[PDB]
Amino acid sequence: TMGNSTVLSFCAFAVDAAKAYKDYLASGGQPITNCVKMLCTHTGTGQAITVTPEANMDQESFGGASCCLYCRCHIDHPNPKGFCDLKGKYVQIPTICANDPVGFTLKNTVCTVCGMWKGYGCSC
Ligand SMILES: [Cl-]
Ligand SMILES: [Cl-]
Ligand SMILES: [Cl-]
Ligand SMILES: [Zn+2]
Ligand SMILES: [Zn+2]
Known part of the structure; x- marks a missing residue:
């Protein structure tokens, strides 16, 4: 497993950072960690x-x-x-996807109707 700084640097300087992160994930790379989790109800x-x-x-x-x-x-x-x-x-x-929040936000789209993620929370 590579390290957040290694992964982020590799994507940061790629012509297409999102593609680089998606292709890394699809190859089995460890997701970027140290996202800021919130305590909530x-x-x-x-x-x-x-x-x-x-x-x-x-x-x-x-x-x-x-x-x-x-x-x-x-x-x-x-x-x-x-x-x-x-x-x-x-x-x-x-x-289910909270092990990869960076990759999740990248790949998904908020439903313009109900304001929830299309294909997950969106039941439209
Ligand atoms: Cl690192
Ligand atoms: Cl912590
Ligand atoms: Cl959702
Ligand atoms: Zn941003
Ligand atoms: Zn919806």
């Missing part, structure tokens, strides 16, 4: 990204920036305005 709304921790009974809440590959790699976010949708907020991760 687990009777929250279950929404994916919120101003305060909102985990329901099936989720864990994390500090948003600590689960953001771009934030963890100190690089720009892959959009024009460069705004980060996780920084300063709290991200709800299904506990």
Whole structure:
């Protein structure tokens, strides 16, 4: 197992950091650790990204920036305005995937309707 700094550096300087992290994970690499876990009641709304921790009974809440590959790699976010949708907020991760919050936020998308993760919490 490589070390967070080794993994993050490798992704940070790749032309496509997300691809590099996804390909590492698919090869069996250990997920990036030391994300900031929140203590919370687990009777929250279950929404994916919120101003305060909102985990329901099936989720864990994390500090948003600590689960953001771009934030963890100190690089720009892959959009024009460069705004980060996780920084300063709290991200709800299904506990099944809580061993890899960085990879989870990367791969998934918040349902525009119910504000929950598509394919997990989203029951639309
Ligand atoms: Cl390391
Ligand atoms: Cl700890
Ligand atoms: Cl969810
Ligand atoms: Zn970020
Ligand atoms: Zn939905």
